[PDB]
Enzyme design. Structure first.
Site, PDB file in Angstrom:
ATOM      1  N   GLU A  33     185.301  25.166  38.215  1.00 18.47           N
ATOM      2  CA  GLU A  33     184.002  24.873  37.657  1.00 18.47           C
ATOM      3  C   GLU A  33     183.210  26.158  37.346  1.00 18.47           C
ATOM      4  O   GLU A  33     182.260  26.130  36.542  1.00 18.47           O
ATOM      5  CB  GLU A  33     183.153  23.878  38.516  1.00 18.47           C
ATOM      6  CG  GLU A  33     183.779  22.486  38.825  1.00 18.47           C
ATOM      7  CD  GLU A  33     182.843  21.628  39.635  1.00 18.47           C
ATOM      8  OE1 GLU A  33     182.343  20.623  39.151  1.00 18.47           O
ATOM      9  OE2 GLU A  33     182.602  22.043  40.864  1.00 18.47           O
ATOM     10  N   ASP A  63     177.305  26.027  44.478  1.00 10.63           N
ATOM     11  CA  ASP A  63     176.483  24.973  45.017  1.00 10.63           C
ATOM     12  C   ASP A  63     175.711  25.485  46.269  1.00 10.63           C
ATOM     13  O   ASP A  63     176.127  26.439  46.935  1.00 10.63           O
ATOM     14  CB  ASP A  63     177.305  23.776  45.582  1.00 10.63           C
ATOM     15  CG  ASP A  63     177.831  22.788  44.573  1.00 10.63           C
ATOM     16  OD1 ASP A  63     178.202  21.641  44.903  1.00 10.63           O
ATOM     17  OD2 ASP A  63     177.828  23.275  43.344  1.00 10.63           O
ATOM     18  N   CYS A 123     174.300  15.207  46.288  1.00 12.43           N
ATOM     19  CA  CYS A 123     175.479  14.517  46.769  1.00 12.43           C
ATOM     20  C   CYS A 123     175.652  14.786  48.255  1.00 12.43           C
ATOM     21  O   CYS A 123     175.046  15.734  48.778  1.00 12.43           O
ATOM     22  CB  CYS A 123     176.698  15.032  46.043  1.00 12.43           C
ATOM     23  SG  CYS A 123     176.586  14.723  44.238  1.00 12.43           S
ATOM     24  N   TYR A 168     183.062  10.055  43.711  1.00  9.64           N
ATOM     25  CA  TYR A 168     181.843   9.346  44.018  1.00  9.64           C
ATOM     26  C   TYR A 168     181.955   7.974  44.674  1.00  9.64           C
ATOM     27  O   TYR A 168     182.647   7.093  44.164  1.00  9.64           O
ATOM     28  CB  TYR A 168     181.013   8.988  42.737  1.00  9.64           C
ATOM     29  CG  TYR A 168     180.685  10.202  41.967  1.00  9.64           C
ATOM     30  CD1 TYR A 168     181.521  10.673  40.962  1.00  9.64           C
ATOM     31  CD2 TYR A 168     179.521  10.885  42.324  1.00  9.64           C
ATOM     32  CE1 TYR A 168     181.161  11.823  40.248  1.00  9.64           C
ATOM     33  CE2 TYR A 168     179.186  12.059  41.644  1.00  9.64           C
ATOM     34  CZ  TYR A 168     179.998  12.511  40.615  1.00  9.64           C
ATOM     35  OH  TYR A 168     179.601  13.699  40.019  1.00  9.64           O
ATOM     36  N   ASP A 187     170.458   4.503  49.339  1.00  5.00           N
ATOM     37  CA  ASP A 187     169.143   4.786  49.859  1.00  5.00           C
ATOM     38  C   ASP A 187     169.191   4.482  51.373  1.00  5.00           C
ATOM     39  O   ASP A 187     170.064   3.743  51.862  1.00  5.00           O
ATOM     40  CB  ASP A 187     168.056   3.916  49.249  1.00  5.00           C
ATOM     41  CG  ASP A 187     167.593   4.536  47.936  1.00  5.00           C
ATOM     42  OD1 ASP A 187     168.108   5.514  47.447  1.00  5.00           O
ATOM     43  OD2 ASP A 187     166.657   3.855  47.382  1.00  5.00           O
ATOM     44  N   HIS A 243     169.792   6.473  45.527  1.00  2.27           N
ATOM     45  CA  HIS A 243     169.582   7.771  44.947  1.00  2.27           C
ATOM     46  C   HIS A 243     170.294   8.938  45.559  1.00  2.27           C
ATOM     47  O   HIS A 243     170.034  10.040  45.122  1.00  2.27           O
ATOM     48  CB  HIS A 243     168.070   8.040  44.793  1.00  2.27           C
ATOM     49  CG  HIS A 243     167.301   6.866  44.216  1.00  2.27           C
ATOM     50  ND1 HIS A 243     166.997   5.720  44.947  1.00  2.27           N
ATOM     51  CD2 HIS A 243     166.740   6.718  42.991  1.00  2.27           C
ATOM     52  CE1 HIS A 243     166.242   4.923  44.181  1.00  2.27           C
ATOM     53  NE2 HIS A 243     166.093   5.498  42.987  1.00  2.27           N
ATOM     54  N   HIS A 283     183.703  21.873  45.903  1.00  2.00           N
ATOM     55  CA  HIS A 283     182.564  21.925  46.793  1.00  2.00           C
ATOM     56  C   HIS A 283     182.532  20.711  47.726  1.00  2.00           C
ATOM     57  O   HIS A 283     181.928  20.748  48.796  1.00  2.00           O
ATOM     58  CB  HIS A 283     181.256  21.999  46.011  1.00  2.00           C
ATOM     59  CG  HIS A 283     181.164  23.216  45.129  1.00  2.00           C
ATOM     60  ND1 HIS A 283     181.415  23.181  43.752  1.00  2.00           N
ATOM     61  CD2 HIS A 283     180.842  24.512  45.425  1.00  2.00           C
ATOM     62  CE1 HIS A 283     181.267  24.406  43.267  1.00  2.00           C
ATOM     63  NE2 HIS A 283     180.922  25.247  44.248  1.00  2.00           N
ATOM     64  N   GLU A 293     174.692  21.462  42.484  1.00  2.00           N
ATOM     65  CA  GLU A 293     174.945  22.688  41.751  1.00  2.00           C
ATOM     66  C   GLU A 293     173.682  23.524  41.501  1.00  2.00           C
ATOM     67  O   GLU A 293     172.616  22.975  41.200  1.00  2.00           O
ATOM     68  CB  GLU A 293     175.547  22.365  40.351  1.00  2.00           C
ATOM     69  CG  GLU A 293     176.704  21.339  40.385  1.00  2.00           C
ATOM     70  CD  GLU A 293     176.245  19.906  40.277  1.00  2.00           C
ATOM     71  OE1 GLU A 293     175.172  19.423  40.688  1.00  2.00           O
ATOM     72  OE2 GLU A 293     177.159  19.238  39.630  1.00  2.00           O
TER      73      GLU A 293
HETATM   74 MN   LIG Z   1     181.439  21.448  42.217  1.00  2.00          MN
HETATM   75 MN   LIG Z   2     181.161  19.028  39.561  1.00  2.00          MN
HETATM   76 MN   LIG Z   3     162.724   4.109  40.892  1.00  2.00          MN
END
Ligand SMILES: [Mn+2]
Ligand SMILES: [Mn+2]
Ligand SMILES: [Mn+2]
Ligand SMILES: [Mn+2]
Lengths: 216, 216
Positions: B26, B30, B55, B83, B88, B125, B142, B163
């Site tokens: 990349e 980060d 993340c 992912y 939340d 979020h 990362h 990042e």
């Molecule tokens: Mn990365």
């Molecule tokens: Mn990435």
């Molecule tokens: Mn909202």
């Protein structure tokens, strides 16, 4: 607060507008812009001043046309925030998908009239949001607000939104920010004035729409 | 570049560390921190200086313990960035989930030893990321780097990463930022020096681990 018609005009001109939801709701202001021509530099600005979670409100018609399924089947968000699966731009200029260039690109592509499902990589770094069919009068959120503006201004039915946070203050030499939060009310207006943007309430947005559609 | 052991020490002290992946990968840096005690103010800083897409690298064991399914079944990301569904904090102090307070809270909760699936609202979020079982030597990203540091420093197996972008420069009175991008190489080191952080390469991280584990 600016008058809706003037907000619409700015919007149609490719500008961000500052939009506040009800105080009893999120009591937040988002930066809302048309996705079809959002520039790299504008995206940089958006990232800099917002939460950085860049979303892209779009219609149900678009979610189906572009094959963007809801992230979750049993939506646990109290607001029912309609996230689709995330995406990146399938484009030769894309690299990691997170830079202002990449995210702005994904946004324009989602708005392109020739857009196709294969144009996007899933998952990714931009977050499409499904506006409800009834628009702002049905759900008084920034998602609907962004799509509504698109309609109002005659643009492609894809907007870009993100919350304007309060990054608090810098602490010289330390990896912290003091007294952060979310920008609210008057501070949002001031924020808008500072950057030459129009600012309004979804509430007035609804009043505008009601002029043509009546109260839901 | 700081020595891994010193990076580990900072990490164990609850500090962010700056981590660079390979240039051929990349070529990004980060901000990586332990999730268990990330503070509201630290989160504000993280949001301010990064992409804003916060993340939370965690182990497979954690994804199962906490019932965090992968966002997508057929992962189209070229890096296979793992992912999970977003979340939340299910906590009385949570409001909209995006403020530095809310996001920091979600992170600590995902790291709590007593963490349970019902502690999180999906979608949300914060973005948990599933590190691969083989750690950094297997996947040089990362995500693995954050989980590896957690292990190395004896912390809960949940990190926080984002990042470090180049927000370019402000344009007085205009909603744009000129010449934005991603921070790279020397600028990352400088960034680290500016905020009193340690900075290293995943490559040296791997070399460190190899001392005990041998080359994969
Ligand atoms: Mn990365
Ligand atoms: Mn990435
Ligand atoms: Mn909202
Ligand atoms: Mn909102």
């Amino acid at each position: 607060f600016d008058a809706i018609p003037d907000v619409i005009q700015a919007f149609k001109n490719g500008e961000f507008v500052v939009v506040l939801d009800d105080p009893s709701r999120e009591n937040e202001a988002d930066l809302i812009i048309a996705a079809e021509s959002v520039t790299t530099e504008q995206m940089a600005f958006m990232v800099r001043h917002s939460s950085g979670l860049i979303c892209a409100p779009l219609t149900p018609e678009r979610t189906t046309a572009l094959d963007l399924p809801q992230m979750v089947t049993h939506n646990a968000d109290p607001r029912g925030t309609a996230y689709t699966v995330s995406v990146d731009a399938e484009h030769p200029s894309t690299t990691t998908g997170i830079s202002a260039h990449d995210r702005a690109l994904a946004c324009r592509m989602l708005a392109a009239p020739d857009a196709q499902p294969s144009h996007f990589r899933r998952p990714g770094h931009v977050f499409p949001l499904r506006a409800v069919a009834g628009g702002v009068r049905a759900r008084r959120g920034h998602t609907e607000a962004g799509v509504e503006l698109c309609r109002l201004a005659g643009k492609r039915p894809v907007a870009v939104i993100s919350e304007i946070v309060d990054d608090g203050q810098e602490v010289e030499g330390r990896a912290v920010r003091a007294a952060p939060g979310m920008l609210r009310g008057d501070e949002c207006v001031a924020f808008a004035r500072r950057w030459g943007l129009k600012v309004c309430t979804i509430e007035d947005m609804i009043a505008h729409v009601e002029k043509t559609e009546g109260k839901l």
